[PDB]
Symmetry: C2
Subunit: 213 residues, 2 copies
């Protein structure tokens, strides 16, 4: 919105490309900077001794993140794993620059607070979907969020502009891949979605959304 | 920490809320921002059926009513904020915040830290909710409460909260019946004790590693 305008100051800041799959920060990296994602989808996650990961966030275009750095800076380290879930473009300021920025250009402070406020709300939406007791509805709820966060109008309805694997979904809705496959199958044979080259299209979100609630 | 100092400007009076009394309802305009000073506030989502699902258990010193920073009165509340314990808080109308932040920048940073902190806490909740078996969903949840509302006691750490089986079920996305069974198991296994609705976990550092 205007976060873009804000972040593009603070130097002329250069964009950063991240190829799909490439990690933006690792657990253990010092929380020394703040990020505005400009294009693409970033996936925050928690990584276990086993090597398995659990998805804590799918950040969407225009999301501020790396927020821990506003608490701590170097003081403490990252404990989540930020990864380019699609090809990604972002800005990235070292935190101390932010302070000095906000001090002098207050206008940004408000915009910043709105950014974070918006994130609190989106996380809570995720809690809500995760709170569903049956997986069928956990899934549909999750898809509906993606429909709004990454949706693109298409002839058959709304298409989730994301390469979603069954495993990525499983790690998002706290499920096994096998169960995601079965559920996605059921949705398809019920003429509610279609998947083409890993992109899901939901035909009638407003319907699906009311069909469950 | 210092949010307290910040909010106490704007001389603002505290507000008491009796346990169970609602702080805002779905449909109330997002007219103001809140700092909870003492007690526990429960944000939830309310369904046609009347049933509710817990989205947050806010903890002493949490900023909340955050939607008002996006929209002000222009859009309405869609969550239900309720005093889960007796509560004391401050409550500024948003436009007063803007003017505050404009003039006392120092607060802006402090504010951003408050919201940052909230993003992280919510993500912790996502994590517990992500556990595939309820046993571990429960334990993970209890461990959060141990840190958010824990008080040292002789037998270990006591969660300073009146937690019913139904409140728990609404927090970890479970049926009441299952919460009763799970809590039973935890007790018969000498891992927690519950008195007069307060849960005490004997060895959090152990329980926390016992599962991970
Ligand atoms: O939610 C986020 O912004 C990512 C978590 C985080 O801020 C961090 O690890 O520093
Ligand atoms: O996360 C919060 O602060 C409560 C959600 C909120 O601000 C609202 O529903 O207006
Ligand atoms: Hg949508
Ligand atoms: Hg603890």
């Amino acid at each position: 919105n205007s976060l873009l305008t804000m972040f593009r100051e603070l130097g002329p800041l250069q964009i950063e490309q991240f190829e799909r799959g490439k990690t933006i920060f690792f657990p253990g990296d010092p929380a020394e900077r703040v990020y505005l994602l400009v294009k693409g989808a970033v996936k925050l996650s928690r990584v276990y001794e086993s090597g398995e990961e659990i998805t804590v966030a799918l950040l969407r275009e225009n999301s501020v993140f790396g927020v821990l750095s506003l608490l701590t800076g170097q003081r403490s380290d990252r404990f989540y794993h930020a990864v380019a879930f699609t090809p990604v473009q972002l800005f990235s300021v070292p935190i101390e620059f932010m302070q000095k920025a906000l001090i002098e250009r207050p206008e940004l402070a408000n915009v910043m607070l709105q950014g974070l406020s918006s994130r609190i709300l989106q996380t809570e939406m995720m809690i809500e979907t995760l709170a569903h007791r049956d997986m069928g509805s956990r899934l549909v709820s999750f898809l509906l969020i993606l429909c709004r966060d990454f949706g693109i109008p298409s002839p058959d309805g709304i298409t989730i502009d994301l390469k979603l694997s069954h495993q990525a979904i499983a790690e998002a809705i706290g499920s096994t891949r096998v169960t995601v496959t079965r559920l996605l199958g059921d949705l398809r044979e019920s003429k509610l979605i279609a998947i083409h080259k890993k992109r899901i299209t939901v035909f009638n979100p407003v319907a699906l959304s009311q069909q469950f609630s």
